[PDB]
Amino acid sequence: KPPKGMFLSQEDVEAVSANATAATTVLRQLDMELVSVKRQIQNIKQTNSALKEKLDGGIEPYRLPEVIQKCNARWTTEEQLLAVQAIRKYGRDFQAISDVIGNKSVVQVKNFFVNYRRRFNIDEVLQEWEAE
Amino acid sequence: SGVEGAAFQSRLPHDRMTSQEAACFPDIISGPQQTQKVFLFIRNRTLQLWLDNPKIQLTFEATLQQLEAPYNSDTVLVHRVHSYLERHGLINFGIYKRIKPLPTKKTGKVIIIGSGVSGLAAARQLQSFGMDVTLLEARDRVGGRVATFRKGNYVADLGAMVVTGLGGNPMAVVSKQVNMELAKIKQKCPLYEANGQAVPKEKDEMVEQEFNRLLEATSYLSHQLDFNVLNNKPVSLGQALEVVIQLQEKHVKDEQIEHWKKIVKTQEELKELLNKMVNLKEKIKELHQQYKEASEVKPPRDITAEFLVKSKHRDLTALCKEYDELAETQGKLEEKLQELEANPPSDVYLSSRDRQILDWHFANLEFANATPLSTLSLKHWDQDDDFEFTGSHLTVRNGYSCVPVALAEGLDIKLNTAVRQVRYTASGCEVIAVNTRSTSQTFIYKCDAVLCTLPLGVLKQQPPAVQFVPPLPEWKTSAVQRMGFGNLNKVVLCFDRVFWDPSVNLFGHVGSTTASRGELFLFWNLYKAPILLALVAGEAAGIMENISDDVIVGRCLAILKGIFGSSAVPQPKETVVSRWRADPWARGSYSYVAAGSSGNDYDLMAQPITPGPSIPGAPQPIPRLFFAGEHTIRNYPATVHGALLSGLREAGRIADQFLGA
Ligand SMILES: Cc1cc2nc3c(=O)[nH]c(=O)nc-3n(C[C@H](O)[C@H](O)[C@H](O)COP(=O)(O)OP(=O)(O)OC[C@H]3O[C@@H](n4cnc5c(N)ncnc54)[C@H](O)[C@@H]3O)c2cc1C
Ligand SMILES: O=CCCc1cc(F)cc(F)c1OCc1ccccc1
């Protein structure tokens, strides 16, 4: 029930009246508290300004061009051999495996996992991936 | 309505009987509702007839002829109601032409100490009732704290000068009885900071509003947080305002800390994000080198060499995707951080200019209460608030003294007679007094009863100006100690020409320090001849009394020169400076509800004193020593109307005691 924009808690009232110099002490500690928060803002602004200056150049010297490859349905020998190595390295990450081969959808990779499960010791290969 | 307005104008509920009426008509208030309504109409109509023409006495016979059936059928009831109104001063008070000339058989003898308004009003009543009345006045004039300076065409009031609203105000009746040139006080009051520049309209309003909100807050602090005692002593309005202001300054710092903490939290979220990016950039940089080396193994290559190119490629685009998202988040954070960096909460609760203007509003309150805010009772300082009259405040253009002078016509007033001692016994009273012009001329006044209307300042004197034999009992002296008696002074400045704004009755000077906020803070243009009044309030009142008039007038002219220009302000032709605390017949200006006091002390002040028996085992004596004056009326203290009412009260009380009701 206090006027709008007045602030008057029982808690604060006692803290400003419990002592002869309670008020100025309270407000002094809030002054120093604010000073040390501003001090901390200065250190981070300068720390972050140094970090921004390291990101000068973005990653633009390092971005490859984006090639699109017509998602073909036939598995060349060379494409099967890429999948087996991608399994060895990426496990069940069907997306990464697709991105490596280039012309094979995520599902086509999944289908590959079963059709060539026997002939490519795919189980042995996944076990081999889980060691490292 | 009409009979309803009569009750309202008499400070009476129209549809209900008061405590006082219950006392005089217990048969009616304890009886059926229908007779109470008949009583209330008889009372309200008799009030109306009186109010509709207060220049002539309203007699019982005249009242009955004007009542109509069924209300004029119980004539005993009408006569009882009329006499009640007459005795208590609700009709036929003030100055009226008397139909039946005053009977010569005078019954009883009353000495009235003081011929201010309270003393005068009682005396008029007591004479009307047939008693022998003498007033003893220390000064060479009537009116007490109604004191009008008059020289030539210059007329200006050194004491009371404002008639509050006329709705419910007994001064309204008096003003139809006395030629008072009442004029509305336009409340617009421009302020000029110490450098003479006007306070811009934006700032005048921001701070007045803050002033009003600070007052509300102390009241919240009083009622909701029961913050009424601190360190075993009663809290004052002053302390409460300090505590409220301290907490608003605290909240401003709390809000600043909360704000910069949102910036630190965000900067730190950004630091962590940047560290994640410089490491990812380095990892990308090194990976690209690998992709470059592997793709420079010119084909035809075996399928592991091909897998190396294609998987480094895939690994690199993923890290670039990871880095592109982290940079999208870096923009979202640098946004928050720039919005926050641009929304800083208020820097300060009040600037130094703010605080000075605020102090003018505090000085204005110190004026209204004639006392520093550190002395006002937080719990009770505004207890008379629910009794304020309705209507515009007014001033008395021909000088308020026209009222006491008029009331004094026909009374036996011994001026220049300072009471030194009040003796009251079971058999009567003796008032010992001296001539103020040669204190060796001693006077003894024997009487049935003494109405003491000495100011609370005089009653407070140690050592005493006026000795009571036997001494006043503790319950009365303790009240006298607790009650506040404050101080307020005026500087009258009479010029030959008007250099201020003629359509502006008030303007303020904003002092530069809290300490001096009461010093010449407000100026009044109230009169026909070019006169400015200047107020000294608060802590400044008492201090300026030990400064010469020439310096006080000098400080005034300096202030006015700053506001209106050095060439526009000539030297005054006449100046007066009040020193009310030093006035030994006043010892202050008017009472205030002090910390540690309350409304009940005003009732205690009004309680009469009853001596003990002369012979032991003798029947209980009647009361002998009665009290009136502004310090004796709980609901209207510190006013002229309050004093007038208190005199009417005691005259009824005394007449009831010595003539019978
Ligand atoms: C500066 C100032 C501004 C005010 N402004 C406001 C205002 O504008 N409007 C308003 O309504 N009220 C105001 N008041 C208050 C108002 O003036 C008083 O409440 C009222 O006039 C006092 O009436 P009273 O009869 O109780 O006391 P007083 O008028 O003081 O009467 C007491 C009398 O007793 C006399 N006396 C004292 N000692 C002795 C003694 N030893 N022997 C004999 N006689 C003695 C005094 O001289 C005086 O005449 C103001 C008062 C002052 C001083
Ligand atoms: O000149 C003296 C002022 C006397 C005074 C004392 C009161 F106790 C009540 C008043 F009505 C009043 O006068 C008008 C006033 C009203 C509000 C604020 C300040 C003054």
CATH of residue B308's domain is: 1.10.287.80
Q: Counting Cβ atoms within 10 Å, is residue B266 exposed (0-12), middle (13-18) or buried (19+)?
A: buried
Q: Which residues pair with B136 in a beta bridge?
A: B113, B414
φ, ψ at B533 (rounded to 5°): -100, 140
Residue B515 DSSP code: T
Q: What three-state secondary structure class fits A64?
A: coil
Do residue B394 and residue B333 come from a single domain? no
Phi-psi region of B82 (alpha: psi -120 to 50; beta: other; left: phi over 0): alpha
Q: State the total domains in chain A.
A: 1
Same domain flag for B212 and B339:
no
- Using DSSP, state whether B230 is helix, strand or coil: strand
B548/B411 same-domain check = yes
Q: How far apart (Å, rounded) are the C-alpha atoms in residues A100 and B521?
A: 87
- B220 & B271 share domain: no
B298, B320, B350: which is the final residue of a domain? B350
Secondary structure class of A18 (helix, strand, coil): coil
Cβ–Cβ under 8 Å, residues B609 and B623: yes
From B350, B384, B400, give the residue that closes a domain.
B350
Strand runs (DSSP E) across B562-604, as ranges?
Answer: 574-577, 591-592
Q: How far is CA A44 from CA A41, B268, B278, B339, in A?
A: 5, 7, 16, 17
User: Nearest residue CA, atom 13 of ligand 2?
Assistant: B162
* Lookup: tokens for B190: 């421009």
SS3 A48: helix
Alpha-carbon span B366 to B354, nearest angstrom:
18
User: CA torsion B285→B288→B294→B300, rounded to 10°?
Assistant: -160
Q: Is there a contact between B130 and B659 (Cβ–Cβ < 8 Å)? A: yes
CATH assignment at residue B27? 1.10.10.10
Asked if B361 and B207 touch (Cβ cutoff 8 Å), the reply is: yes
Place of tokens 């004596």: B621
- B526: Cβ contacts below 8 Å, ≥ 6 apart: B156, B161, B183, B185, B395, B397, B505, B533
Q: Are B7 and B44 in contact (CB under 8 A)?
A: yes
Which atom of ligand 2 is nearest the CA belonging to B164?
11
Q: Which of B593, B590, B539 shows the shortest CA–CA distance to B146?
A: B590
Buried (b) or exposed (e) across B399-416, using 16+ Cβ within 10 A? bbbbbbbbbbeebebbeb
Q: Are A85 and B304 in contact (CB under 8 A)?
A: yes
CB atoms within 10 A of CB B577: 22
Which method resolved this structure?
Answer: X-ray
DSSP H helix total and E strand total for chain A: 6, 0
The CA distance from B174 to B54, in Å, is: 8
DSSP-derived letter for residue A62 is: G
Name, in order, each residue with C-beta under 8 angstroms of B420's C-beta and a sequence gap of 6 or more: B432, B433, B434, B465, B466, B467
**Which residue, B55, B76, B108, sits at the end of a domain?**
B108
Q: How far apart are CA B255 and CA B652, in angstroms?
A: 61
- Domain range for residue B60? 1-108
CA B268 to chain CA centroid, Å, is 55
- CA end-to-end span of chain B: 32
Could you give the CA distance from residue B197 to residue B215 in angstroms, rounded to a whole number? Answer: 27
Indicate whether B427 and B491 sit together in one domain: yes
- B360: nearest Cα among B188, B537, B236: B537
CA-closest candidate to residue B400, choices B551, B174, B575: B174
Residue minimizing CA distance to atom 47 of ligand 1: B585
**Does residue B393 share a domain with residue B310?**
no
Vertex B643 angle, CA B639 and B645, to 5°: 115
E strand spans, B196-248 = 229-230, 233-234
Residue numbers in B near A12 (CB within 8 A): 247, 250
Nearest ligand 1 atom to the CA of B458 is 38
How would you write B443-466 as a 3-class SS string? EEEEECEEEECCCHHHHCCCCCCC
Query: In angstroms, what is the span from residue B368 Cα to ligand 2's centroid?
Result: 5
Are the C-beta atoms of residues B451 and B112 closer than 8 Å to each other? Answer: yes
CA nearest to B400, candidates B142, B54, B93, B124: B142
Q: What CATH number does the domain containing A56 carry?
A: 1.20.58.1880
C-alpha B78/C-alpha B67 separation (Å) is: 9
Per-residue DSSP letters for B165-181? -SBT-HHHHHHHHTT--
With the C-alpha atoms ordered B218, B223, B229, B234, is the resulting torsion angle positive or negative?
positive
- Residues B510 and B363: their CA atoms lie apart, in Å, by 9
Token digits of residue B374? 């550190």
Per DSSP, the three-state class of B520 is strand
Run of H or E residues at B494: strand B489-494
Half-sphere exposure of B193 (CA within 13 A, CB side): 15
SS (H, E, C) B69-91: CCCCCCHHHHHHHHHHHHHCCCC
Q: Are residues B117 and B206 in the same domain?
A: yes
| Among A6, A34, A96, beta carbon nearest to B257 | A34
Cβ–Cβ of B264/A47 closer than 8 Å? no
Return the residue matching tokens 């937080």: B378
Distance CA B164, CA B390 (A): 8
Q: Identify the H or E element spanning B237.
A: helix B237-295
Domain count for chain B, please give it.
Answer: 3
Positive or negative: CA dihedral B561, B566, B568, B571:
positive
Q: Check if the beta carbon of residue B108 is closer than 8 Å to that of residue B448.
A: yes
Please check whether residue B274 touches A, CB under 8 A.
yes
- Chain B neighbours among A 24-63 (CB < 8 Å)? 26-27, 30-31, 33-34, 37-38, 40-41, 44-45, 47-48, 51-52, 54-55, 58-59, 61-63
- The range of the structural domain enclosing residue A4 comes to 1-132
Whole-Å CA distances, B363 to A66, B200, B218, B357, B514: 78, 19, 17, 10, 9
State whether residue A126 sits within 8 Å of chain B by CB. Answer: no
What's the DSSP call for residue B566? G
- By C-alpha distance, which of B144, B115, B147 is closest to B492? B147
DSSP B101: P
